[PDB]
C-alpha cells in the first residue's frame, strides 16, 4: 500500500459506474448528475483544461526588434515519459550588422 | 495613417523621443504649391 488516489465520479472506478437510474435514486444520487468531478474534503472539484503549445513540431516565427531575424523552436517531449520539454531554437541573425 | 485617442494622449502627456508614427506636414512657397512639376 503506497497511498490513496482520488476517484472521479461516474468514472470506470467509481461505485456509480454502470448503475441504473433506480439504483442511483436508491443511493440518493441524481440520475441527471453528469459526473466528472472529484470530492475533496467534502467539496466538489473540477479540473480545467489547460491550453499549451503543441509539442514535437517545428514552428518558425519572428521577433519584433530582437537580434535575430527569424527563429525556429521545436518543443520536444518523449511519449510522456519524463523531461517535460526542451525547446531548442535555431535562429538567424539580422541583416543590420555594423 | 497616424495614431489618435488613448495612445496619442499617452504619448503627448509622457513625451517620448521616439513617437510611434512621427510625421512632418510641409507647405510649399510658390509655383511649387500649384503646379505638380515642382511639387
Amino acid at each position: 500500500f503506497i497511498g490513496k488516489i482520488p476517484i472521479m465520479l461516474r468514472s470506470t472506478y467509481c461505485l456509480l459506474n454502470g448503475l441504473t437510474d433506480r439504483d442511483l435514486c436508491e443511493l440518493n444520487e441524481c440520475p441527471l448528475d453528469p459526473g466528472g468531478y472529484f470530492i475533496i474534503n467534502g467539496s466538489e472539484k473540477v479540473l480545467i483544461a489547460q491550453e499549451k503549445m503543441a509539442t514535437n513540431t517545428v514552428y518558425v516565427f519572428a521577433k519584433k526588434d530582437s537580434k535575430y531575424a527569424y527563429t525556429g523552436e521545436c518543443r520536444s517531449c518523449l511519449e510522456n515519459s519524463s523531461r517535460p520539454t526542451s525547446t531548442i531554437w535555431v535562429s538567424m541573425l539580422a541583416r543590420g550588422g555594423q | 495613417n497616424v495614431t489618435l485617442g488613448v495612445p496619442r494622449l499617452k504619448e503627448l502627456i509622457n513625451i517620448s523621443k521616439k513617437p510611434k508614427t512621427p510625421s512632418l506636414t510641409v507647405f510649399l512657397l510658390g509655383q511649387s504649391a500649384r503646379d505638380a512639376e515642382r511639387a
Partner: protein
Amino acid sequence: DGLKYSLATGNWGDQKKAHQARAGVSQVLNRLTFASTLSHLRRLNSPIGRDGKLAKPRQLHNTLWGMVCPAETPEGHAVGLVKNLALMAYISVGSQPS
C-alpha cells in the same frame, strides 16, 4: 497528501514551491443551475496573463469553428482567455503509434 492538496487548493505543484505553481486548476464546482454545472464541466483556459494588454490571443480566431463556442466567454479581465467547448466537440485521449 500531495494529490489531496493539489486538488484542494488548485496550486498545481508541491506545497513548498507554490510560488511558480500555476493556480487556477481544480476550481470548486458551480451548482447554481444545471446549465452552470454543465458549462463549468466543459471549460478551457489559456494561461496567458489576465493583465496582458496585447489582446491578439483574446480574439476569436477562424480555427475555432465547431471546436469552441463563438459567443460564450466571460467579460472583464479574462475576456477571450476562458472558453467553452462546442456541443459536438471531442478531445483525443491518446494512443501509441506502434
